[PDB]
Design a binder for this molecule. Structure first.
Ligand SMILES: CN(C)c1ccc(-c2sc3cc(O)ccc3[n+]2C)cc1
Ligand SMILES: *[C@@H]1O[C@H](CO)[C@@H](O)[C@H](O)[C@H]1NC(C)=O
Ligand SMILES: *[C@@H]1O[C@H](CO)[C@@H](O)[C@H](O)[C@H]1NC(C)=O
Ligand SMILES: *[C@H]1O[C@H](CO)[C@@H](O)[C@H](O)[C@H]1NC(C)=O
Ligand SMILES: [Mg+2]
Ligand SMILES: [Mg+2]
Length: 533
């Protein structure tokens, strides 16, 4: 009976599930931490006390408490990211997908979902590991971590609400997989962590954090870097927002201990309803509770760690999508609509810019406009629309990831960069939105292979190709075949900075991803902002 496994925590009864005219084992809801409920709220996570009897891991677990997106009711496009299980503070569980027959010492891949550190679920249809597991024969694991105030509230100095506890949950999970994935046919020495958006930043933060380095082999980052503008705040800013939440719930603000009691007596929803009120500025692509540069989990500043090489050195595979900013513009920028091509007016554009670089002074905003405005056609509604897409995209995702790539590729042991620019055939979103943030995930997980999902033959091709690169990487540290005639995915180097694009057409090798616009974001602007504040 391959559905029965004994782990250093207890026994787990899996379940045999269908996967494209075949089957594989599935262990859903394996707990790896004690319920972070009641007194535990905001505290670090403590390990799950070994359970007696046989734990039933045959159906996905509860999701963590979070904001739910109700901007476009009954619109799968947006609702596909919403929790699809009962929200609950008790949500520290993980999922395993094992091939059949159960292999031994095979490649493991742990997925870290994204969602800006404020939302997420390891049980979305798009994160079903069965396909990947089955097709490439690897033990796919999808973990979970606390999000929102519940996983990142940061009153640095306290021991009850230190912050980064969310990142800690992902660790304990990575730990558990470490001391247990073998029983499921996994090889704890060939673990590859991969996540998108906040998940990507997470992977990269584990590459930085010393207390995580020894828990995985290589790593993959999708549309998200650890040094992202939105991926973290200073202990000061975190404490401010922490107090701010309390003030928003009529809490005793005198001492940390008082504040913590108050926030612990409030119902999950009471905290969620005012979550957004703590953000310092009116803006987009910014979230309240996120990783804090504490001095522990993160030894020193991120730029300093990257510049000195103070971080796990191994092979990494990462990339971005053609239109990282469209999603966020649609939800919080003026002029945009889901029912039209959103031609943005000049007045709206200025608005949109300020909502994208909220920390920028008036001069900084001008620098941004000049940099992204065509003065030979400034009224073109289409150019302004795309302009913002690139602005939000480059500032929040591409450029940060680019900065990281380079800084990393100076101490690492191999880098593979990609440019996902394929516009799905069944996409439910408008066309101006192009290749949307986070929409490259369905291909990494092989959802196109499903015929009922109505994907074009060529898209199943791509999905299969991507899954191979990905799994192949995890297993070998290189996405290319050992010796095939297929075109190779160049290795990214400080000198040539090559990268490929991921789409249906035949591979093309490009050089210096958005190098121009990124000099602006990584050098000039910051330099300007600092000298003029
Ligand atoms: C699915 N994606 C990418 C997404 C979904 C939702 C949001 C936001 S930003 C924001 C700001 C605010 O003050 C209130 C609500 C709110 N919501 C819901 C941003 C991106
Ligand atoms: C949990 O395992 C039991 C077997 O004892 C099974 O009958 C049940 O369907 C599983 N999940 C549920 C429905 O709670
Ligand atoms: C990785 O390390 C090995 C052995 O230490 C070395 O031979 C190889 O050149 C490195 N690969 C890259 C591309 O850095
Ligand atoms: C593909 O998607 C639809 C959407 O629900 C599904 O019902 C059906 O199996 C497919 N559409 C058809 C019948 O062409
Ligand atoms: Mg009280
Ligand atoms: Mg664009």
């Amino acid at each position: 009976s391959e559905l029965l496994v004994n782990t250093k925590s207890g026994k787990v009864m899996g379940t045999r599930v269908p996967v494209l005219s075949s089957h594989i084992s599935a262990f859903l809801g394996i707990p790896f931490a004690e319920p972070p409920v009641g007194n535990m709220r905001f505290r670090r996570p403590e390990p799950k006390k070994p359970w007696s009897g046989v734990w039933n891991a045959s159906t996905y677990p509860n999701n963590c408490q979070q904001y739910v997106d109700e901007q476009f009711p009954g619109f799968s496009g947006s609702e596909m990211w919403n929790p699809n299980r009962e929200m609950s503070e008790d949500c520290l569980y993980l999922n395993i997908w094992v091939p059949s027959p159960r292999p031994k010492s095979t490649t493991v891949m742990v997925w870290i979902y994204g969602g800006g550190f404020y939302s997420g679920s390891s049980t979305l249809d798009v994160y079903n590991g069965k396909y990947l597991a089955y097709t490439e024969e690897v033990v796919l694991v999808s973990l979970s971590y606390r999000v929102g105030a519940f996983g990142f509230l940061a009153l640095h100095g306290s021991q009850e609400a230190p912050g980064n506890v969310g990142l800690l949950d992902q660790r304990m999970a990575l730990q558990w997989v470490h001391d247990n994935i073998q029983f499921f046919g996994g090889d704890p020495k060939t673990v590859t962590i991969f996540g998108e958006s906040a998940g990507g930043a997470s992977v990269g933060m584990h590459i930085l954090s010393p207390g995580s380095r020894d828990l995985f082999r290589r790593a993959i980052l999708q549309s998200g870097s650890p040094n992202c503008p939105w991926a973290s705040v200073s202990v000061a800013e975190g404490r401010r927002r922490a107090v701010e939440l309390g003030r928003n719930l009529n809490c005793n603000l005198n001492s940390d201990e008082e504040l913590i009691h108050c926030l612990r007596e409030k119902k999950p929803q009471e905290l969620i309803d005012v979550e957004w009120n703590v953000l310092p500025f009116d803006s987009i692509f910014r979230f309240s509770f996120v990783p804090v540069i504490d001095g522990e989990f993160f030894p020193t500043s991120l730029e300093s760690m990257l510049n000195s090489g103070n971080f796990k050195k191994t092979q990494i595979l990462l990339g971005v999508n053609k239109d990282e900013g469209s999603f966020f513009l649609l939800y919080g920028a003026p002029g945009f609509s889901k029912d039209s091509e959103s031609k943005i007016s000049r007045e709206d554009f200025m608005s949109g810019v300020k909502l994208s670089v909220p920390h920028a002074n008036d001069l900084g905003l001008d620098a941004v406009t000049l940099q992204y405005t065509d003065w030979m056609d400034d009224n073109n509604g289409i150019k302004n629309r795309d302009g913002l897409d690139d602005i939000v995209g480059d500032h929040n995702v591409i450029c940060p990831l680019m900065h990281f790539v380079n800084k990393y590729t100076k101490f690492g042991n191999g880098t593979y960069l990609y440019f996902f620019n394929h516009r799905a055939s069944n996409l439910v979103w408008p066309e101006w939105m192009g290749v949307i943030h986070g929409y490259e995930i369905e291909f990494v997980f092989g959802l196109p292979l499903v015929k009922e999902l109505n994907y074009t033959a060529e898209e199943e091709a791509l999905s299969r190709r991507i899954m191979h690169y990905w799994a192949t990487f995890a297993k070998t540290g290189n996405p290319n075949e050992p010796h095939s005639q297929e075109s190779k995915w160049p290795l990214f180097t400080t000198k040539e900075q090559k990268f490929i694009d991921l789409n249906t057409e035949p591979m093309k090798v490009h050089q210096r991803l958005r190098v121009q616009m990124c000099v602006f974001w990584n050098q000039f602007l910051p330099k300007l902002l600092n000298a003029t504040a």
